[PDB]
Amino acid sequence: FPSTEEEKQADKAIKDIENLIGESGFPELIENVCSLKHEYTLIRSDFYDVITKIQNKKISLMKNSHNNRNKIRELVQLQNNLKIGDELDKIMGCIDTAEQEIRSAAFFFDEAKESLKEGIIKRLEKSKNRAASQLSKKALNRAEDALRCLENYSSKKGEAIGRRSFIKEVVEQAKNALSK
Amino acid sequence: GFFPSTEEEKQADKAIKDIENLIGESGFPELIENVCSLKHEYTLIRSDFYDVITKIQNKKISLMKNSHNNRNKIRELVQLQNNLKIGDELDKIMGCIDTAEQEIRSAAFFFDEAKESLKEGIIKRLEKSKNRAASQLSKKALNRAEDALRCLENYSSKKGEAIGRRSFIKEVVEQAKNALS
Numbered sequence: 542f543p544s545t546e547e548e549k550q551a552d553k554a555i556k557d558i559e560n561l562i563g564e565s566g567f568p569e570l571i572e573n574v575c576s577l578k579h580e581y582t583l584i585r586s587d588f589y590d591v592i593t594k595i596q597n598k599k600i601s602l603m604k605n606s607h608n609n610r611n612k613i614r615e616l617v618q619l620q621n622n623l624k625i626g627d628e629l630d631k632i633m634g635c636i637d638t639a640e641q642e643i644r645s646a647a648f649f650f651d652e653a654k655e656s657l658k659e660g661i662i663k664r665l666e667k668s669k670n671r672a673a674s675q676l677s678k679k680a681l682n683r684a685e686d687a688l689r690c691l692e693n694y695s696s697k698k699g700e701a702i703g704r705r706s707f708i709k710e711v712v713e714q715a716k717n718a719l720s721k
Numbered sequence: 722g723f724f725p726s727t728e729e730e731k732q733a734d735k736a737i738k739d740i741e742n743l744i745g746e747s748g749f750p751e752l753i754e755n756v757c758s759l760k761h762e763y764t765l766i767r768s769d770f771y772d773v774i775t776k777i778q779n780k781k782i783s784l785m786k787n788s789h790n791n792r793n794k795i796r797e798l799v800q801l802q803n804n805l806k807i808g809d810e811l812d813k814i815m816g817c818i819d820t821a822e823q824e825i826r827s828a829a830f831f832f833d834e835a836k837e838s839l840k841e842g843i844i845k846r847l848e849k850s851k852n853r854a855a856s857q858l859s860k861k862a863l864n865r866a867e868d869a870l871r872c873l874e875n876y877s878s879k880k881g882e883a884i885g886r887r888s889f890i891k892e893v894v895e896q897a898k899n900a901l902s
Contacts, residue, residue, distance in 0.1 A: 568764040575757035582750045582829065589833045596840035600723060603847045647764070651771045658778040665785040 543657070545664065547677040551657045554684035558650055561691065567647035570694070574640045577701055581632055584705060587712045588629065594719050595620050623715050628708045635701040639694050646690035653683035725843060729859035733839050736866035740832055744873070749829040752876065756821045759883055763814050766890055770807055773897045777802050780901065801900065807893055814886045821879040828872035831865045838862035 543552040562570065595616050602609040602616075660676035663669075725734035744752060781798050784791035842858030845851045 566768060568761060568768055571764045572761050575754075575761060578753060578757055579750070582753050585829070585833070586750065589837070592837060593840070596837075596844065599844055600840070600847065603844065604723065606847075647767075651774075654771075655774060655778070658775070658782065662778070662781055662785065665782065666788070 543661065545660075545674060545677055547674050547681065548657060548660060551653065551660070551677050551680035551684060554681055554688070555650075555654055555657065558646075558684060558687050558691070561688075567643060567650070570643045570646075571640070573698070574636065574643060577636050577639070577698070577705075580705055581629075581636060584632075584709055584712065585629060587716070588623075588625070588708070591623065591712055591715050591719070592620065594716075595623070598719065619715060619718070623711070625708055625711060628704060628711075632701055632704045632708070635697045635704060639697040639701065642690040642694040642697065646687045646694065649683050649687040649690060653680045653687060656680035656683060722843070723847065725839065727842075727846065727855075727859055729856065729863060730839065730843060730846070733835065733842075733859050733862035733866060736863060736870070737832070737835050737839060740835075740866065740869055740873075743870075749825070749832065752825045753822075753829070756818060756825055756876075756880060759880065759887070760818050760822070762887065763811075763818055763883075766814075766887070766894060767811055769894050769898075770805075770811060770890075773894060773901070774802060774805075776898070776901050801897070805897075807890055807897070810886055810890045810893070814883055814890065817879050817883040817886060821876050821883060824872045824875040824879060828869050828876060831869040831872060835862050835865040835869060838865060 543549045559566075599613060599616055602613055606613070656676050657680040660673055660680060663676055664673040722730075725731050741748075777798050781795055784795050784798075788795070838858045839862040842855045842862060845855040845858060848855075
């Protein structure tokens with residue numbers, strides 16, 4: 542059992558992460574990220590459904606181009622402003638970063654759990670040129686790193702929800718300008 | 722026209738409409754959800770794999786109380802642990818799925834570009850003064866539609882390979898659990 546202080550320190554950090562992520566672990570957090578990729582596609586879908594409607598109206602108005610001279614431009618100027626693809630990009634970016642940090646956190650978390658236990662085997666063997674404490678230090682500062690990655694994850698996931706709610710409203714607005 | 726009338730427009734139009742029929746309505750959203758689900762499965766097998774390694778490492782600690790009389794039973798666990806390279810199939814699966822994710826994502830991005838370009842080329846045709854531009858767009862449309870189909874091909878080969886690798890490691894892991902009993 543964890544005895545060397547350094548082990549109880551590595552131990553308590555592992556338990557922090559376990560309680561933080563809960564009974565369902567990194568797989569749960571991966572699924573949270575999947576769900577976001579789902580949100581992303583649907584809002585990309587809604588965005589391009591709107592471009593399509595603008596283009597189909599333009600074509601329809603091009604029957605009498607000159608007469609509809611201002612109305613084409615409003616839809617020209619609608620499409621250019623509704624060129625918010627750099628916000629869709631930013632959401633993609635945020636999501637990609639998040640799924641990155643949950644793979645770093647999972648890999649690091651395992652590295653730490655595996656390292657504490659090698660640490661305890663090394664001490665049970667009395668093979669003590671600190672090799673025991675070296676594993677138990679690597680363990681703590683793999684936990685720290687897993688917690689770092691869970692930190693950045695939470696930031697980027699939030700930015701995603703946020704950016705997505707902004708563009709979803711800009712799309713629904715553009716959409717309900719056309720439906721009349 | 723006031724519709725796809727040009728030969729390159731009609732070809733670009735057919736290609737796009739073949740994708741729509743091939744994958745069905747909401748086909749991209751659904752295809753993205755499938756790999757994401759498969760990724761979920763992968764991380765559950767990865768989590769089992771690590772839970773086994775932990776089961777092992779706890780057995781060693783347990784037997785270590787009596788290192789002399791359990792030396793051979795402990796050396797057998799030092800092996801089953803190293804002798805895994807189930808790690809070697811997990812990252813291989815991870816790689817497969819990441820490719821499939823990137824392929825289906827590119828398929829949808831390209832599809833959206835193809836449609837977008839088709840309707841801009843037809844608009845630019847209807848202007849009658851910009852036929853060189855109305856050509857590049859009907860052409861861009863066609864390529865991005867072909868790119869899309871290529872990405873669908875790649876998706877289904879990488880997904881297929883992922884599923885084959887998924888099945889194997891499940892029984893390997895499931896055996897490694899059983900072995901500890």
